[PDB]
Amino acid sequence: CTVLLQIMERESGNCPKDRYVVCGRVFLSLEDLSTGKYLLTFPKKKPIEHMEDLFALLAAFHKSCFQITSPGYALNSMKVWLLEHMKCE
């Protein structure tokens, strides 16, 4: 697979600046993966130290956002839940 980043300007309604850049190429196969090497398979890859692996999970996973207003309190149970009940690193 060849890998192509396209860029258009939004300020300009002429679209004067359609640059592109072929930013490289990714070869892959079953023999690459037969030996892992690119997979992420879970918990053994708990200690996350090649940042590629974190960003893979930030693209591939289903992102859902939330506003939380507790209006007759303030809101610190989050840190406990996060660090305690869920045991976040």
Next chain:
Amino acid sequence: VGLQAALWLSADRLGDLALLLETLNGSQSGASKDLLLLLKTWSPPAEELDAPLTLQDAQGLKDVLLTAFAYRQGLQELITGNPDKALSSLHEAASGLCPRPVLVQVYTALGSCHRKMGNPQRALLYLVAALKEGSAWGPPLLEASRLYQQLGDTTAELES
């Protein structure tokens, strides 16, 4: 124990409360005569598996106690003229459960702490905050009057 503790802390029986928590934890925590340590060191024991229901658990109480005891330690140390021991407990008050009326108090109070140390500007902010998150804004306007005498800002004092 949380309950026993709620009573005795309504009753100012903190020597015995400490004592109970010391036998509760290791009695190795026997030198550690601060409460605010023991209350934290106390672990409510289980996730409280499928039992008869309750209305409230050790955690949800433990959490009322830390905030309550800390709040009381704070006003004690302020009036008794240690507006440096105070600020530790009055920020332990805003942190862990602090219902907003509990906060407006924490904030008027730190307005005094800093007025007493001679920090009129640090005080003023905590007082403006107490205003907004205020449903209860007599005591801040009072702390402002006492601040505007202390600077002598007389028109401001009378207005507050």
